[PDB]
């Protein structure tokens, strides 16, 4: 029943468990929005939203338990060096169990037990008190103490997911969306923390007001289960806490939660306040923490400093990721620009003539348009013998079948010619091979129209001008070289004037290549 | 009549159609500025501006349908593998029409039909009612559902344009300006959306006020077509909606649209309010959304989140584009600085004497000034044989003509020597070739002056100090070695002390190269 | 008298002209701070500040006209290709004058004539009116129309200065400080523009309030030359202009200029208001335009958009410059980290033993510490023959003079050997070559201690352990092989167990290189 580390079952399980962990990290901070402040100056907790969040977190936690179960029945590749083979997987249950308990089980278990699920639904009635609402506001430390192990373990899991899937994306879409996903998650967490802290500070303000009016107030009057008491309503109508605990008054510094209290975010429905808190987190994380006009209290200042540093790190990482995206997108255009700048500066230093200057840049433009960087030969030797030989045969089969000698011959030397064949490029009105010049390039025309004429060695009259097009033959003198049994070295004078009249791409090949092939 | 995809006609038509699509993307958001709030608290539609925008968008839609007509009669490169040639263009109308129907027609047609031009001019008068102004405020969903396909297809078409015209710019101007154009377009769209949403929220505030005063008010009573009614005057005199619906009052939470009513942007002329909305978009997109002190409403919060995320993406893209511009404009200086610091650190690690340091770090500086990087050999081999030989013969024609050997002899060996010469430099006060040193490179002086003397083998007296300068010849010993018929391998020693009086740029050639030339 | 374009005189003249242009750019916008709003609601200009600024601008324009003179008496390089030489300077005054008038005269002369020095000092006193103070606020267009040519031609001058001095800095200090200098210049220009526009807005408010009080006011009271008039003081007493034209009131929209009146910048001394406006420009360039709560005015909105775009561009340039600075200062550590990560992954994939992985890792750290990147042979072959041989002789003179064969022998083979030496590294406790292994390298010890012993061919007892240290000799077997007159191809076996006890630097010598040298 032990699953192989690289089995597809483990891969799909890790994928769906990454999805489940993202759901867990999105849902856990939502427990901070449970408290609701009503108009009667009371703190109540929505039962329906609490039940929904408890159910969702129970599903997430049972998924975590299933992950623990699966990881407790998986094999690990033993660090055996050996010489050959890779099957160092351990099928013994005791060995894999000891390996997992030595490292991995503690952090994966401290973040999997449903302690938040129980201490809200089974412990609060059992807790030493009869007030559910009050003892659920400051003691929500379990969420933030179990969130850290989950947020820590989410990174290595994503590392294995992106490692075991080949390339993450096409150019950088995954690399840019991952940081935005983490960024939205950080915004959500900060918004939930901000709402909880605003509720805490508003409760502190209410406690301060009760201390100011201790004659007819006691600390538990702000519990919303006691709002119906006659003493509660009498104190509420007599007291003026609904005005004192407001940012407009100077009684108590609300700091950055004055924005929460003024906007009445603590009294609205769940969706409205959730979206407001998420936007607040996004805004104060994106603006680098500016606008957090905090007060002289250590907790709120620490929260603001954490927000500012997290915003710095996340914004800088986003800028870096988008820079990497752009570099991956262009990369080739940048090198082409560098080459064009170099070939425009060098020809300026040497003071080339204008009539010849407009030719090198035209050839460079032709090369970029018809090839788009991509060094043919460097990428060509990278492929194996099978793939390289097959692709060279497929690309140039009818081209080599036009040669009278190569047509009726075995594939032994044919594939030798195909493998060693090289690309060729030529711009418009290029006198490719004038009559007389040595012919040491064997060109096969793959695209374009050519013109080649023989003026009887230099005499006007009988012309050999042929409208050579794609898939034609040229340089027959090198074929005469290949056909000559004697290993001579005297270069043949060109008998024709090969000129590139049109938009032409060719396939040049070295004369010594024919010499070596014929020598075999 | 079918147009070739690579023809100039399609290329120029795509240029003018990109211009038309940019006009469409700039004009379509302007429809949101039609509603105008008068001083008597009524929503009116600018008739002249509406007519102008209908005319402009009708012209844009005519251009769009002409584009559909043109692309309906276009040719494609068929996926025929073949071996040679590129004439895969299909002339048949049935096949091109069928494949265009399969992909391309739906997306380019849903963003081409003139729905905004009909549902404002021919539908509202025929709508089930008589309130033209009232039923033109909230139902502007057609603009935002038809704008998305246009902005989606502007990217592939712009990519085609920039791919069909070679390099986009000189260094990075096109790359840097495209992002800013998109940035202004996003700011304009956000400003138009902000104005429309501000009108929406102010209408909602008016509806809330009317609900508070339902005794003598109606929901359709706010339609500005009924401003002259006696009931209108009576209610407006009695009611206090002028002050109640304002950010100063606390009746209704305006939030981020409060700046519109405070600055009275919903009342001014078209140009003032258009510029205010555009600036609002640009400012709240440039500052990543800070200052959007939202209200506890889901739609406005979602709009603010969209603004923040779009601002983050656009700002990161701009940073990346500018960094790419900086890397492209310098590039060559970067590895020059790298080489300078490497040769400074290496010269310190090996503890070279101070006198010799001033020579190496001056030679490097002179090379940087004279060539500015640019690997002459590597850049030169990329050019074809014809271009290479032409460049070499133009650079060195009279230089090689001064030699007593190569002057009166055939251009074949002149071509051979010229195509294979290499550049060479020397710094100030260089003992280039002292007497007795081997003559391995013979040099052609093209820029600078030399100073070589022969002191009778080391005896004071008769001096051969000649003011040898540009366009001269040096290293005759290698010339004599090449002139020797017997293929000897003895390297002649220099008979003179070749010394560079000043900075000199020269052309080098290895002795074995000249031996190979003389062999043929 | 015609000066060489590359001469030292022109270089120093262009340096001091760059200084003068920067002074002009920092001084000319100061003319916007001339208007001062007094306490009695009037506009006046300080005479002393105007005199000081006009004197400084006169000095700057004198320098500009001297630059016109100098560039009208300079030589230009004729675009003659030629074959040899670079003496293409044209001494003909008529030709250089005609070339200058064709291009460069207009754009430099439009920024040289002293229009601000005449239309303030001779024109306004002779203008059709007596209000010298009033006619110096609206006509401040000459400054902004002449500034653009200066800010345009400053860039080519800076490019020439930075291209006429080799490298600009060590790594990127100049490339990062230039951006800050430009950024301060932009902040200064925008601050001056903001002050002038604030004065214009306040004057527009004054015109509006005089329109409201047309009965007892006309438009000329706000010129301060009439402050002592009875009508002026009576109107000031009766009118409420003191508090009406304030951003606190809602009479007239001050927009972003509310900060100007609230902070009372337009009534303080020169230094205070200048620093406040400069900080305003700096902050609203750095804050990307946030805080510019504009009004519904076209000019203000366009100004805010210009500020936002300038801030975006300048911030992007600064980010790019700093990234370039960091990549230039690190660069070498980058590929070292890449290589270390790559080799760690390579040993991880091949499953190397933990005892041999540490040795390769220690060798990598040794190489990084000893060389810090820097491809020794690649950097060495780039130098010319004179420098390379001198460097080799200095690095290894007695090292090759310690072997008896080369010491009392000619320097020919000495230099031949020294040219072909390559450095060799061996980490702590490196067992270098066994007893009996073929001798392939002839290494010379330059720094470190060795430990080599012979156990009588493998028998315990007589030991040849010697404390070989710096400046010692090894690899005698290759020397004996080279000493043999017969060109045999057998590699002698090592008769010692050479081992590097400590940190050792070596100079490996190729065996076939030694054979080639001895063959000469």
Numbering used by the authors:
A (entry chain A), B (entry chain B), C (entry chain C): 58 to 577
Give the published text.
Cyclic nucleotide-gated ion channels (CNGCs) in plants mediate Ca2+ influx in response to environmental changes. Among numerous plant CNGCs, Medicago truncatula CNGC15a/b/c (MtCNGC15) is localized to the nuclear envelope. The MtCNGC15 was reported to be activated after the sensing of Nod factors and negatively regulated by camodulin (CaM) to fullfil a cycle of Ca2+ release and retrieve between the endoplasmic reticulum/nuclear envelop lumen and the nucleoplasm. Here, we report the structures of MtCNGC15b in the absence or presence of CaM.
MtCaM has been reported to negatively regulate the activity of MtCNGC15b, but how MtCaM binding affects the CPD of MtCNGC15b remains to be elucidated. However, the MtCaM was not stably co-purified with MtCNGC15b. We then fused the MtCaM to the C-terminus of MtCNGC15b through a short linker. The fused complex exhibited good solution behavior and dispersed evenly on cryo-EM samples. Consistent with the previous findings on the inhibitory effect on channel activity, MtCNGC15b exhibits closed inner gate. Instead of accommodating cGMP, the side chain of Arg553 in MtCNGC15b occupies the hypothetical pocket. MtCaM binding significantly stabilizes the cytosolic domain of MtCNGC15b, as evidenced by a lower RMSD and confirmed by the structural observation. Based on the structural observation and electrophysiological analysis, MtCaM may close the channel through stabilizing the CPD of MtCNGC15b and modulating the local conformation of residues near the arginine.
